[PDB]
Homo-oligomer: A and B are copies of this chain.
Amino acid sequence: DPEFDLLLKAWKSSGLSVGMKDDELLALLESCSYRVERLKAEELYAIGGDKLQDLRIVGVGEIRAEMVGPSGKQILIDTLAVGRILAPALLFASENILPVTLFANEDSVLFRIGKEEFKGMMHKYPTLMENFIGMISDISAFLMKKIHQLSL
């Protein structure tokens, strides 16, 4: 599959794959299903709080993303190349979901894996689990450091 190959390069590029030999990777992903989101270069997209409860990974291209506060204040800008995960820390969140806006610097593709299926994928492969938990852990640690910077 060509499209599957893309996903694979993306995951290899992603942080989620660290510590996995190729067999594990392929094991993980062949028996896994996903929809595809296409993003036409230089158009804008908003993704609200509840449509953010899916794993999304940049498979193709590059997008610019930023959370927006409860006031419209735009925080945490980022450029996400191939392999980055969109808003990973909010996948499994219940309260306080700021929405996010995306700008396509090029034509771009996000692979979208559903929340419940991903929940299983992590259960089947503990390395995947440690990786995803570490990912959102580091994000947290960072936010904590940026909160120091913005205090008195």
Contact = CB atoms under 8 A, between A and B. Distances in A.
A33 interface: no
A20 B144 CA distance: 31
A21 to B, nearest CB: 18
The 4 closest A-B pairs by CB, nearest first: A69-B148, A96-B141, A89-B140, A143-B143
A90 B141 contact: yes
Nearest to A135: B92
Which of A122, A134, A150 counts the most chain B CB atoms within 10 A? A150
B138 A69 contact: no
B136 A133 contact: yes
Contacts of A75: 144, 147-148, 151
A95 interface: yes
Contacts of A142: 95-96
A146 to B, nearest CB: 6
